C-alpha cells in the first residue's frame, strides 16, 4: 500500500537557497505499508520519498 504523504520543513530559507544554488525543497515522508497475503503481517515503514 501507500498512505499519508506528509512533509518536513524546508531544507533552507529562500535567499540562502538562491545564494547557494540549492532548490527550495522540503522532504516527503510517506507511511508506506507492505502486507503479505500468505501469512499476514503489516510492514509499516516511513519511507522518505
Amino acid at each position: 500500500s501507500f498512505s499519508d504523504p506528509r512533509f518536513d520543513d524546508v531544507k533552507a530559507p529562500v535567499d540562502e537557497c538562491k545564494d547557494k544554488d540549492m532548490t527550495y525543497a522540503a522532504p516527503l515522508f510517506v507511511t508506506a505499508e507492505f502486507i503479505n497475503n500468505n501469512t499476514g503481517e503489516i510492514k509499516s515503514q516511513t519511507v522518505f520519498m
Binding site: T23, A32, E33, F34, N36, N38, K43, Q45, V47, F48, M49
Partner: protein, 50 residues
C-alpha cells in the same frame, strides 16, 4: 516494485528494500528543470513577474 516483488524472498523484505525513489525524484527534477512549462521568472519589473 512489481518486478522485484517476485524476485525478492518472503520474510526478508521491507518497503525500504522494495521502493526505488530515484526515478521519482528524477521525474520531479526532470520536470522542474529542462521542461517546456518550467520557465525562468521573467522579472525585469514586477508587472512582468505578475
Amino acid at each position: 516494485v512489481r518486478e522485484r516483488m517476485t524476485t525478492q524472498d518472503v520474510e526478508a523484505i521491507t518497503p525500504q528494500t522494495l521502493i526505488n525513489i530515484r526515478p521519482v525524484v528524477a521525474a520531479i527534477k526532470e520536470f522542474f528543470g529542462t521542461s517546456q512549462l518550467s520557465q525562468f521568472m521573467d522579472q525585469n519589473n514586477p508587472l512582468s513577474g505578475l
